[model samples]
Target chain A: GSAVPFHGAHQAGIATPVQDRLHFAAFDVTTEDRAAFVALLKEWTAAARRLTAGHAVGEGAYGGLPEAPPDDTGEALGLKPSRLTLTIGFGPSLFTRFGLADLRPEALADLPKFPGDNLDRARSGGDLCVQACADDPQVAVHAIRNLARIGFGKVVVRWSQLGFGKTSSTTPDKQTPRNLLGFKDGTRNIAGTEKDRLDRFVWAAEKDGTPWMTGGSYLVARRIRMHIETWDRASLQEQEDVFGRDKGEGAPVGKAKERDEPFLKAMKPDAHVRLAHPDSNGGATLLRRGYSFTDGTDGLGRLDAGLFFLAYQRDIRTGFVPVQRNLATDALNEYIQHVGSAVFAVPPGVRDADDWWGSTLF
Target chain B: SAVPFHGAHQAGIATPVQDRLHFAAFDVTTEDRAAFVALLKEWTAAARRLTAGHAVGEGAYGGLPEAPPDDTGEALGLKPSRLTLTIGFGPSLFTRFGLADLRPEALADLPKFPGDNLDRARSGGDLCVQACADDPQVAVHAIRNLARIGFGKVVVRWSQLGFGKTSSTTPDKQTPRNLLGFKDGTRNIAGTEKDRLDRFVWAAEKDGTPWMTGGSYLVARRIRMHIETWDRASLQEQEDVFGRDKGEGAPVGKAKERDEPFLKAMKPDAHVRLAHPDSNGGATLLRRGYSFTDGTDGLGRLDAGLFFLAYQRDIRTGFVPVQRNLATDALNEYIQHVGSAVFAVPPGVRDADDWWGSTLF
Candidate 1:
């Protein structure tokens, strides 16, 4: 219902309190002309500014040229900003084009295939991505649809995911949302107010090989499919044993409160929380802002439902890679699979009205 | 908040449309009529509790520890979200329970229409449950739990989860849009218009089905839109198809959204013009459709469209005639009716002890 400031030191989405809906898209550049691509970015940035501020793009959806296409899609016309935020990122394949080879942030390298990944190539990588989030699904969808319409010739959507019932939140005061597994996920996720931890783990440094990524972060998006029926049939105790937390309160194995310090030794060795805790992975922490998704039935009577796991960090090597490798032994793996994987180098946010997305790199 | 579940009629038909929907069609798998009747009573009890913000049976936890939880725990700690679950019986359902002689004439099978690209897997069912809620997970939970309860008795033939309501019973609020990005349900029936509700929505004993008194007939159609093609068309072409301006959703030559349309001034095959009550012998429907996107269609295109749900006194005088007249609709070029079903909705539960279909069963 309120507008999130569009111009800031960093993008609004990563640290902004999570919205109720998400329409995330990964686009493949369709043009070879550097100037054409740059112009498209400027156009997209201008549209994004209007959209995030609760206005329509350029001439709006109507009353413009009756002969030409409307500048904005009209579906979200009457809707509020819904605290909409549009965050952009550049993927590894992007570096191969636009003479950006030298500028490719080392942290943007392709993620290695992990154990038990039945990756679908169509859902995986892209040259660019836009993460649009809002409290209303239509508003979020309208944002992505309009951006795709604007990028008609220069780019096309490679894949998109619609997520509702946000699985994680940055506002620690709010109740943590649950994943499809029905457990309170992101209970211990990094809060937005922790600027010290944010700088320590989230924002990239110039010393990390790329100056353009100084205030930015690396994003790892995984489409984690939850075997819900299988999990639902498990005994309550066995379910608790897998997560190392009670399903109701989400408290640790030996604790009575959710936020209490987890005694790793008291839980099963393969418990998800025990293995994923920062203490176990050399204190590797991530700023997680994931979402729950249900596309429909899997055509085999089971639901094609899961968690769209979104995590951000200063670097992937010390952040997601090692943590995921460690999760190879996690007991939760039997109930979930990594079906889609992608890593993108997010650029610093737009600084002024004149600046655009990826301004520093281009 | 909770909507009153005990009433002379079902809540969802005229209840303000919720923001989310989870509609499922179930095929009866068992032949035990008495067991099926028992399942209906169990379902009605659970629906009553769910609509009132309570869990079903012992709920998701702290029940008999050895048995699977009565309720799936996903909806735990969630609001009731104004959830309403409306049940319907298909034409085929009558044949299944040895009620062939009691089959309501109003629940006739839908006739095949021109340009219909129907999918058998997603089309018909012996029964259906329309779950509407402000929160998606709550609606999903209601359907999932009911399906879990119906495990041995019925199997889900097909299900659709819609993210955005395309039509509004509260027309004073903002008019929602379909996938085409144009305002929809501009002239929909308002819930407060009791006279119109009685004339068009609620069924009566005079309609030749005494058991359907105070109830309504439902027609659900999954209309898939070729949005990419629609998006490529010019604004003029798009406006021409809908017979309204895209910005204000005003009728052709009209300045405001709710301005009465001069159907003759619009293109002959314009959607609003052809579907207008004036063009269809004054036949009307109370629409409560929703927008859906179920991943991609394997062609790298969005598998998205409007899941059309409408309620009326009878489908013979409502959707059947209207859809038949829409054979020449201009909007048909960019859309196709891929799935369809018709059901005879039973009257509501009048008291705590009264269950669904009590009047007939």
Candidate 2:
């Protein structure tokens, strides 16, 4: 696969075709010097440009001064770009330390504790986050590892998540990807081709009060763990009723096809699709780019696996907050739990070689 | 690509490695040997259907609404993606089911090697299944379905998911690199080399185990790399530890990667010199290792390493002797064997009627 453009008016990952693999890392800024932290951001931007272009980092993995460490780790050497895209976001806490408290977007407020959320403190919250997506696992991992290496003393990784298979896609021409629950998810998600819908629900405008984020979007990451073993034991009819869709066709309760318009009243009040539908949430739409993750077993006999839910929207207040609130009685909640959560204010992408990530804000 | 599911030998052993893996080991909880045999037959039938891109039993849906779906619907619309499911019986399995008489000596438990800090929970099992496919979801689906089929008779002991194949049977293609950032398995045996396969990998009837003819012995080691420390080492030190050029992967004092090693010219305890077949009395192994990253170590470093999978005719002449020779390897400082398993992989199924372990049963 070819590389996605690294420089654009908006970040490439949110609107670009979703890749097969994801390696997302959240970092805690360890440096006190604002200038040093800003320098790290510039350095990360430069390396990202080369990495996404399928070129090695400076001095590469070898042929450098033997006494010093190689600039690139070389694990991804000779590998294709695999449509790599690295998107950076600044967390709410980042504004506190960088003396930019006044610039913090109101939409980046901390998320309220949702019902059935068994969040882990270590996996939650961060000063910064980098979402690396690629078709190749090694390429994605190399990108995050190199950036972390460059920011060695400036930032430390708070938590990292590796997702194997893409669970959602912006390109709707392909078959709708399935979640760990085995039903087709994101069947009604906003497609990248729908520019009119994207402008209205996904992108922020200059009049939104945060000039730095004019073309940007807000990203929410949730580590939702699926109780796969329990779900596997349920009768097929019960499973179908929980999602309000047939197991095979992914059709709505009263429809014959997957794309058929749903008759929401025909389904149970607590069905997942009925509750998550845009009509049920005041017409709030989210651009989801999720991936399925299986992080080994949970010490029990079940897999610690689920969807790493990533959604980008213009504002959380009118977007995720309201939709999640309405899902308080979602029937699917019995088999899933939110273990980690983070929200970041993704700034507009680097415009050219002269610009860098976060330049609009810093 | 759809690899043929019916063959004289298992598809995964010497088959070109796939992009992803889901290897699971299980323990037989049922004391009734007859019931266990029935489960194996059911698993074999399901494997045949699954590897052929067909769902097991009645399809996932459109069946009886009251019973659980026979096939998990997750992989319903997915292609086969060159999927392979190879089964093996551990030494512990032979101990049960009145199978002591049919036990293959090649499947004996591996001896403890120096610097092994193996975790008991991750170590041994009564049975193991190696699932390989181009798609992670397909491989995971196959393993999950198999585990579901054996719910009452067997329980999963441990499982490891891997991506980025570290070794390749099609060596003519670009050699894959390991987590250490250097090309691995350059000197590995290729599937096309039938002589080498017979000499090093496949067991024969003359080897005193008729049931294991054409089968191979597997030695799996979860070798965790101290990647943080390895990443910090200087280039010269790193090359010395591996006894190979970092970028080109050539042997010491050589320009091309395929050049024969001049063992005496390298460091005395260099990894290449100690593990090479020349130094191990002609011992060799067919490696199918894969790179894995299991989150972090809770200390800030990646819990990443090579999930080393090796196949040989017999451990005594294969992994055992070669690994013993590496007691003083320089590369040992930055790696440790955290989990280990040995399995007596049975010969392949011959036809539609043939089931796994049919010869032994």
Candidate 3:
């Protein structure tokens, strides 16, 4: 049970230990109905409370009305809570509707295009995003699917991804997992133990814009298509050369252990680690929680598998932009493509037990 | 682990149902008989190691420092978790190696059914592998490693990663839910029936196909469940569609899941009425099905549903009728059969000296 307290200064998934599975969804508001949106959120908040606490939507909620479809989908009935967390986000497009344009945070600006990005328009923009993570896949999926089902005509799912495995770790005790590449990633991530580091890098500062959103941070999602077929054929040395880390031990270019300092000068100029490091990008960082995804196969006989990258940071300009710009020349670009991109202004934590997500904005 | 892989029959078939699955079908890249045999031998050794709670080639962290690690190394600290590997030969495999004569008479193509929106890319292959384990990673690792070894000899044609099992082969286990959110495999044939296993499951040499003596046949269909439309339906409508109580999973007039299904009470076109062996002329399969969810398409629809896998003594008598009976099922409005394939599953490895297809090869 990787259950962390659901009530927190911010959403749990951003800094919490990465769950075993993820069911992420981005929905588009189908109508210009404001009250409908608020109703959906209120219902969603109540459902989230039950789900995260490991209760069925109707189980303790008065055993639910006997005549109606149970508020909670019953598939997850017997399952443990598994520490599911639901974090909601508002997209830039969402602000344009429902007369809430002024409440849009300046930080909610859409991301800029990066070099070599084959971004798919269909998967890119969304009015809202839900990040649900849990140990049991069905639980995570049930949470999102029920929420979507409940929205009915009010909102429709734009895109969704079911990730079976995690690619990052948030704890010092857990071993940092490898991406599609055979190397330990997140070796330098902001661990949950480091409150000061999280304060500086992850949580939004206490300063003034959209005062209600002070605790929340911006989220950047990138669907990276790993050219594993090419990477698989690459020689072990050549593969290791692109990642700037030992394939087995995950040590840096000149180091003997995974935790050893990455010898910056010893790394190849455009090596993935070098370009992605904060030191190399003037102290920029990202709290990455990537997941591995394999969606059947393409019609051309190739397994469509890659990294579903997620990052939470104080500001995109300082957090995502600077680091991505620095990686414009990354050698690993030869084997991957950014096929999807989205940025959202996640709101502050629901401090009151009765508060709904985005209540302040409404 | 509560299970053992080495057995008189394949572990995955008669063994207790596992929670996760990874099924892959591959096309042979090599036509050389000797080379193909060698590849099978290599794969057998690797499979044995994996089933025994060990690594693929050089157990874990072996001193093959210069080469890529024999095992993928992801399952280093992970347990075997009752992992089992079952191999089968597709109908097309008989065409190769001059083994058409060795193919079972029952190993023919399934005749077209009514509601099939079949995708050619998703169906048919020279060979297929079924891997099941308590943990999803363990199951996936088995397939990935086998695929890695067969890179030069065989290439994956299509693969499915199934997270939850819907079939209950063992009577002791509880039935799991399908994507439609109802108990599935409630009336499935249990693996413990020795007589039934011999009669309906294992192919007897006296019955024909001598090379397939104790072997069985596999029929796989990828059924797409239209959940969005179904979700909008009233609870009563959903119950009527399946001819089973939604919460209790009982037959239309029954009280419990295992209660004898009252076929006469269910609607004629209800899925349960059409599918019940009592309604059909006694056709049964040891269902080994799993549920899967593969993200979504560009058109905003979830490609999520069940990968219906069942093993039987003969597809001609077993699957054909049940599927045909279901063609006009009330449940058809909520589902579509998108992919289909049939394979001849060889008998189990008898001992350490015996490998996957010992009866023929």
lDDT of each: 0.87, 0.88, 0.80
Model 1 spans > 4 angstroms off: B165-172
Tens-digit per-residue lDDT, A1-362, candidate 2: 68899988898999898888899999999999999988998999999999999888877899998988788889988887888999999899998886898999987768998989899999988898999998888888888888988899999889999998988978878888888788887788888889899889888889988899999999999999988888999999999999999989999997899989889999999998899999998898899999999876665554567889999999988789999999999999989999999999999989999999899998
Report residue B32 deviation for candidate 1 (angstroms): 1.8
Model 2: per-residue Cα lDDT over B1-361, one tens digit each = 6787777888898987888999888988988989999998999999998888888999788888998999987897899988999999998897788888888877767888899999988888899999999889999988888988988888878889998642222234888888788998799998889999988899999999998898999999998999878889999888999899889999989999999999998999999999999998899899898899877655668888999999999988999999999999999999999999999998889999989988889
Q: For this target, which candidate reaches the highest DockQ against the unseen true structure? A: 2
**Highest TM-score scorer:** 2
Q: Write the candidate numbers in order of decreasing lDDT.
A: 2, 1, 3
> Which 10-residue window of candidate 1 chain B scores lowest in summed lDDT?
B163-172
Error of 2 at A30 (Å): 1.1
Off by over 4 Å in 2: B165-172
Question: Candidate 1 or 3, higher DockQ?
Answer: 1
Q: Give the TM-score of candidate 2.
A: 0.98
- How does model 3 fare in lDDT? 0.80
Of the native A-B interface contacts, what share survives in model 1?
A: 0.40
TM-score of chain B of each: 0.97, 0.97, 0.95
Rank candidates, DockQ, best first: 2, 1, 3
